[PDB]
Structure formats: C-alpha cells, structure tokens
Design a binder for this molecule. Sequence first.
Ligand SMILES: O=[P-]([O-])[O-]
Ligand SMILES: [Br-]
Lengths: 184, 184, 184
Amino acid sequence: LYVSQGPGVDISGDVNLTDFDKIGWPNVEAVQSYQREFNAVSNIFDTIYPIGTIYENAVNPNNPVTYMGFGSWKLFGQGKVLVGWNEDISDPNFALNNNDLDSGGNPSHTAGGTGGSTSVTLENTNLPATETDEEVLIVDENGSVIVYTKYREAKASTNSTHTPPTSITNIQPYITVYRWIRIA
Amino acid sequence: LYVSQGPGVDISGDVNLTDFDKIGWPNVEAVQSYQREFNAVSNIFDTIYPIGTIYENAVNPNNPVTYMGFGSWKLFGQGKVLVGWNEDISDPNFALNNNDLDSGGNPSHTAGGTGGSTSVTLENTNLPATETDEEVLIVDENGSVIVYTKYREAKASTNSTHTPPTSITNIQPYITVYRWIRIA
Amino acid sequence: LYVSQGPGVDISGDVNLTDFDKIGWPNVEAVQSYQREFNAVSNIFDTIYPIGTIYENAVNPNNPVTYMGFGSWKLFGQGKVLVGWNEDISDPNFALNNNDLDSGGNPSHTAGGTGGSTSVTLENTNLPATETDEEVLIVDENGSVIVYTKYREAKASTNSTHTPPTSITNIQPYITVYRWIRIA
Ligand SMILES: O=[P-]([O-])[O-]
Ligand SMILES: [Br-]
C-alpha cells in the first residue's frame, strides 16, 4: 500500500532569506500563509528541513544537496558553538542580536547574535587582592619603624616582563562537525 | 508512481513526557512497543522527529508547527550549549543529572544535567605561587640582617582595592539559534 | 491521494564509514554516484538522515532505531560540544583534524578535530605584571638608601603553598542531550 498525502497543512510561519551572502536578520522575510500538500517527496522534505534549518554531519564534507537530493545549503557557524536563543530579553549574551542593530545601535531580539573568545589574556584588573606571605618593610608616613648593597624605596614588581602574559584557553571539550543552514 | 508504506516498524523505545512545564527526567515515561505503519505523512514525521527531538533553525522565530505542520514544540536550552551525554559515569560534568536526584540527593545517569558559567571571577585560591622580581627586606626571626618616612613591618598588599576584581568571559565563540524540543 | 515518488535524485556525494569502532576520517570513503528512487519510506529516511547525520534527543535514552525504525546509530561526541568545522584553514582550532594526521604528522582539513578543556589551572606564565600597593625597601646595587627580629634579603613569596592552585571552570552554560551519529 501507499503513503497517503493526508490533509494538507497551513504553513503560516515560514520565512525566506533576502541576503544569501551575509545570512540572518535583518535580511529575513515572513512568507504569507500557504497550503502545503504532500504531492511528492520534495514537499515532505520541505516540512522536515524548512528554510533556516541547521543540519550537521560528522563526516560527509559535501554539500547536503549532493547526498539528500533537495534544498540549497551553506556552511553555518564555522568555528562556533550554537547557543539557544533566549526569549528572556534580560539574558546579556544570548537574547539580543549584535549583528542586527537599529538606527540607535540597539540590537534586535532575534537569533543570530555572536560573541565569545577562544582565549583570555589576564590583565591586572582581573586579579584579586593578594599579600606577601611574610612581613616586609613598607614605607609608611604613619610608621613607627625607623630605618653590600644599598636599597631603593619603590613598589616591588612581580612578573614585570609579562607584557603580555601567556593566554589561557577558553574552549571547552569539542568535536567539529560539518554544519549547514538551508538557505532556499 | 507512489511511495510504498513499506513494512511497518516496531517502535519499542519511544518515550512520552509527563510534565510539559519543567521538562525532562524524572518526568519521562517509556511507551510500550507498538507498530508504526506509514499510513500518511504524519507517521513519517513521527519517525523523523520523535518526541524529544531537538530541532534548530537559525532565522525562523516561529513555533515549528507553523512551518512544518506537525508536532508540539517548546523552546529548549535557552542560553545553553548542548553537550553530549556521556554513557561513562565517571564523567564529572556530563553523565549525571543534577536536575534529577533520588531521595539521597544522588543524580540519575540521564541526559538533562545542567551547569557552567558565563564568566569567572578569580579568587586568591586560584592564583599560583609568585615572588617579587627583586629581593626585598623580609622579617625573619632566623634572619641575619639587622635593621623622610618611617616604615612599618607588615605583609605588603597588591591590588587591595580589587574586591572583587573584574570578571573574565567564560564563553567560547558562538552564534545563537532558535532551538526547540518536540514535546508531543 | 498518495505521495508521488517524484523524480529520483542523483546521490553523488554520499559517504560510508570504514571503521565503526573509532569513527571518522581517515576511515571514510566516498560512494560512487547512484540514483535514489523513493520507493518506500526507508528511502525517504535515507534522504533525511544520511550516513554521518547527527541526531539529538533531550530525553529518550534508547538507540534511535528503536523509536525511528531505521538506521544504525552510535553515541557521538560524548562530553563534547559541537563546533562548526571551518573551511578557512587558518582557523587554529576548528579547521584541521588532529585525529587524522599524515605521515609527517600534519592534520587533514576535515571535520572531527577535537580539543578543549573542562578547567584551567593558572600558572605564573599566565599572570600579568603587578606591583605592591605601597613602596617597600628593595635591594639595589644602584640604590641610594643605606640600611625584635632580624631580616633577610630575599624575593618575597605570595601564595607559596598554592602548588597547585585551585582550578577554574572552563565550561559555559550547558544542558546535556543524547547525541547520536548514523553510522550505516
Ligand atoms: O598578585 P599576584 O602578582 O601574585
Ligand atoms: Br569556556
């Protein structure tokens, strides 16, 4: 026996891209509602992998059309992890899209925000207060202690040659995959 | 010609949710084995996107039912990266689910554990041993050195006003996407 | 009415694995072009979830064949985040595959590279230059200052017992999921 088309479905929330070079908001448009009938496999494919879908393959380097048969696809998020967009606008990282600013420079509440860093290089502002393990002689106008080499009165450096210091990884355990977006 | 239904399949490993507010273990139940016949497109959809499936779209903000036609969907992992659950129980981060504790407080060996942080603020306990670049005069009961301003004998602070210091990012390069779970 | 098979598709970019134990390049082979006709649901499944596809389920612990009906599947990227492979070979982390080296030790430009760390432990090389908040007496052959306890002339330690210091998390906010690769 054969697969029934079933009742068609009202596709009311589709989108299309309006830029295929730089991908994402603001260059996305809503598609007016239309009926999808499952006339053929291509229509099923469109219901499974609508425009914007992210697809990942661990090993196949080729464009997905060559091994799926359908869709137009582009590499997506190269060098990036995916973070879930947050509907809570107070999220300071994952709600507001720095790549889609309004005329006042204000980011939209859309997916496609980017950020993060592969390493960090510590600066003095990042260091907590510390003290020497032992007492030393400290210059003090309110002090009570009266004082082969001579000495100088100066702030004592530590790590003066670390300009800059060695960076530290900021990357958690990963594996890379071929990641694609369906663009049309 | 038409797509054959094929031999049906024995779906022996399906699950359903028993809480749609707080999602995940422990509120998941096994479904007794049943036969799936591919009578219509909806049945194909259920084989591709079974309950629990994670779906991601870079650009479409809408609920996937509105552009797929099928399923019930909820945003998932907002503000989070996905980590692969580890079948090796000795993984200290990614095996045991802190959100699903037994009566003794012990986490289950299930997916849905959460953790991680967007930043770190260094504390003194995180700092390695250091020393001054030059010699200074250090108080020492076993010492041999006899000793406009006076001085005081005290531990010398560094960065005393860094209470707290500036935090450091803990986020690696990302892009946000609309991420969903099929809940029914 | 019934779903049409449609015109078949030329699958020119499929791959197969040649090792199911250790997964990935170099043990991947190209499949010569073949025609896929959508004779049955299984053929549709192969177009949606070709070999190498990554599938994620938040809650279902079982092997996907038991709840999809099709494919052979293995857990993938346990304990890992997925990063998009970079077609730009200059990416120092996410382009070149450390798990697939040539005879000179040079990594291939393929997905499957791994790296990253769950924590960092700071070392002295990572620290920026600092100085004491106040002036102290510093040994100086070019100095002009002539100098209950005695003293010693020595470099003053800080945090001498931090051998090693407390590690710091390197994990950004996450949730774990059951992640699988279709291996056949
Ligand atoms: O304050 P840090 O130089 O040990
Ligand atoms: Br990190």
